[PDB]
Amino acid sequence: EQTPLQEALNQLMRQLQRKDPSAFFSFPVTDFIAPGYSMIIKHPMDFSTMKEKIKNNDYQSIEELKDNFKLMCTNAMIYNKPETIYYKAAKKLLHSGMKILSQERIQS
Ligand SMILES: COc1cc(-c2cn(C)c(=O)c3cnccc23)c(OC)cc1CN(C)C
Ligand SMILES: [Cl-]
Ligand SMILES: [Cl-]
Ligand SMILES: [Cl-]
Ligand SMILES: [Mg+2]
Ligand SMILES: [Zn+2]
Ligand SMILES: [Zn+2]
């Protein structure tokens, strides 16, 4: 029995992962795939961690999920140089994901 907020966050997640066809952001980045990663990135984030937070009722709002999504993409721009495939992928995903997540206030 999931809450309406959990349901809403799951639906946003399905849309966001469709914008990552290479699966670069599905799971945590290890020091084996990315030498020295843990030496540089001190606040890691990825889509599997976000899904576990949803399941554990660790989100209070869509805002919180959007900020963790931003943190995941910004981390790739700190660790990887601008010329690399991972920096370019992060920029593309940040922009398409924010088109999904951003919206106008809704007033009564
Ligand atoms: C090339 O394959 C992968 C690359 C990355 C990867 C991601 N990001 C965000 C990086 O910053 C990054 C930086 N340097 C090296 C690698 C990566 C990955 O991370 C979980 C998983 C795979 C496995 N693949 C079958 C999907
Ligand atoms: Cl992987
Ligand atoms: Cl950007
Ligand atoms: Cl940009
Ligand atoms: Mg708020
Ligand atoms: Zn915020
Ligand atoms: Zn940008």
Q: Which residues line ligand 1 (CB under 6 A)?
A: 23-25, 27, 29, 33-34, 76, 79-80, 86
Name the one residue in this structure whose structure tokens are 């993409």. Answer: 73
CA pair distance 1, 19, nearest whole angstrom:
28
47 contacts: CB under 8 Å, gap ≥ 6: 13, 16, 17, 20, 25, 26, 27, 72
Q: Which of 13, 58, 50, 54 is nearest to 28 (CA)?
A: 50
Resolution (A): 1.5
Q: How many angstroms is it from 103 CA to the middle of ligand 7? A: 17
| Domain 1-108 listed as CATH 2.30.40.10 | no
Could you report how far apart the first and last alpha carbons of the chain are, in Å?
29
Q: Which of 38, 43, 95 is nearest to 71 (CA)?
A: 43
Q: How many angstroms is it from 87 CA to the middle of ligand 1? A: 11
Map out the domains of the chain as residue ranges: 1-108
- The method of structure determination was X-ray
Neighbours of 9 (CB within 10 A): 21
Q: Which of 22, 25, 27, 33 for a ligand 1 pocket mutation test, highest count of atoms within 8 Å of Cβ?
A: 33
